[PDB]
Design a protein around this ligand. Sequence first.
Ligand code: GA
Length: 96
Amino acid sequence: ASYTVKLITPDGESSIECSDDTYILDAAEEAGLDLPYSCRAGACSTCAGKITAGSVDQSDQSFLDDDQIEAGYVLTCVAYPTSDCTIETHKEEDLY
Ligand SMILES: [Ga+3]
Protein backbone atom coordinates (compact mmCIF):
# COMPACT_ATOMS: atom_id res chain seq x y z
CA ALA A 1 0.00 0.00 0.00
CA SER A 2 2.38 2.69 -1.25
CA TYR A 3 1.64 6.24 -0.10
CA THR A 4 2.27 9.66 -1.63
CA VAL A 5 5.77 10.62 -0.49
CA LYS A 6 6.52 14.30 -1.08
CA LEU A 7 10.25 14.84 -1.63
CA ILE A 8 11.01 18.55 -1.22
CA THR A 9 14.14 19.65 -3.06
CA PRO A 10 15.93 22.91 -3.95
CA ASP A 11 15.66 21.89 -7.60
CA GLY A 12 11.89 21.52 -7.55
CA GLU A 13 9.14 19.48 -5.91
CA SER A 14 8.60 15.81 -6.75
CA SER A 15 6.23 13.14 -5.46
CA ILE A 16 7.26 9.48 -5.35
CA GLU A 17 5.28 6.49 -4.09
CA CYS A 18 6.93 4.51 -1.30
CA SER A 19 5.70 1.38 0.48
CA ASP A 20 5.58 0.66 4.21
CA ASP A 21 8.09 -2.16 3.74
CA THR A 22 10.51 -0.12 1.63
CA TYR A 23 13.00 2.75 1.86
CA ILE A 24 12.12 6.24 0.63
CA LEU A 25 15.58 6.42 -0.93
CA ASP A 26 15.23 3.30 -3.07
CA ALA A 27 11.83 4.53 -4.26
CA ALA A 28 13.45 7.87 -5.08
CA GLU A 29 16.60 6.77 -6.90
CA GLU A 30 14.51 4.15 -8.70
CA ALA A 31 12.46 6.95 -10.24
CA GLY A 32 15.44 9.25 -10.74
CA LEU A 33 14.94 11.67 -7.85
CA ASP A 34 18.71 11.74 -7.29
CA LEU A 35 18.59 12.48 -3.56
CA PRO A 36 21.61 13.27 -1.34
CA TYR A 37 22.69 9.76 -0.33
CA SER A 38 26.00 7.95 0.14
CA CYS A 39 25.62 4.76 2.17
CA ARG A 40 22.03 4.22 1.02
CA ALA A 41 21.88 1.46 3.64
CA GLY A 42 21.39 3.05 7.04
CA ALA A 43 24.47 4.46 8.75
CA CYS A 44 24.77 8.16 7.95
CA SER A 45 23.04 11.54 8.13
CA THR A 46 23.34 12.64 4.50
CA CYS A 47 20.14 10.77 3.68
CA ALA A 48 18.34 12.39 6.62
CA GLY A 49 15.38 14.53 5.62
CA LYS A 50 13.48 17.08 7.69
CA ILE A 51 10.00 15.60 8.12
CA THR A 52 6.98 17.43 9.53
CA ALA A 53 3.95 16.47 7.44
CA GLY A 54 3.50 12.73 7.87
CA SER A 55 5.35 9.90 9.59
CA VAL A 56 8.04 7.26 9.08
CA ASP A 57 9.77 4.31 10.75
CA GLN A 58 13.55 4.37 11.21
CA SER A 59 14.27 1.55 13.66
CA ASP A 60 17.25 0.40 11.60
CA GLN A 61 19.28 3.62 11.51
CA SER A 62 22.52 3.80 13.50
CA PHE A 63 23.49 7.47 13.29
CA LEU A 64 20.83 9.62 14.97
CA ASP A 65 20.17 9.40 18.71
CA ASP A 66 17.13 11.39 19.84
CA ASP A 67 17.72 15.10 19.22
CA GLN A 68 18.19 14.53 15.49
CA ILE A 69 14.95 12.62 14.98
CA GLU A 70 13.15 15.16 17.16
CA ALA A 71 13.98 17.91 14.67
CA GLY A 72 12.60 15.83 11.82
CA TYR A 73 15.78 14.56 10.18
CA VAL A 74 14.80 11.08 9.01
CA LEU A 75 17.26 8.84 7.16
CA THR A 76 15.59 8.27 3.80
CA CYS A 77 18.00 5.36 3.31
CA VAL A 78 16.20 3.60 6.16
CA ALA A 79 12.76 5.16 6.56
CA TYR A 80 9.42 3.36 6.36
CA PRO A 81 6.68 5.85 5.40
CA THR A 82 3.65 3.96 6.73
CA SER A 83 1.58 6.81 5.29
CA ASP A 84 1.81 9.99 3.21
CA CYS A 85 4.66 12.29 4.22
CA THR A 86 6.72 15.29 3.09
CA ILE A 87 10.42 14.57 3.60
CA GLU A 88 12.56 17.68 3.13
CA THR A 89 15.79 16.55 1.47
CA HIS A 90 19.01 18.56 1.69
CA LYS A 91 18.93 18.86 5.49
CA GLU A 92 21.98 17.09 6.92
CA GLU A 93 24.37 20.00 7.38
CA ASP A 94 22.28 20.90 10.43
CA LEU A 95 24.05 18.12 12.33
CA TYR A 96 27.63 18.64 11.15
GA1 GA B 1 22.34 6.90 4.39
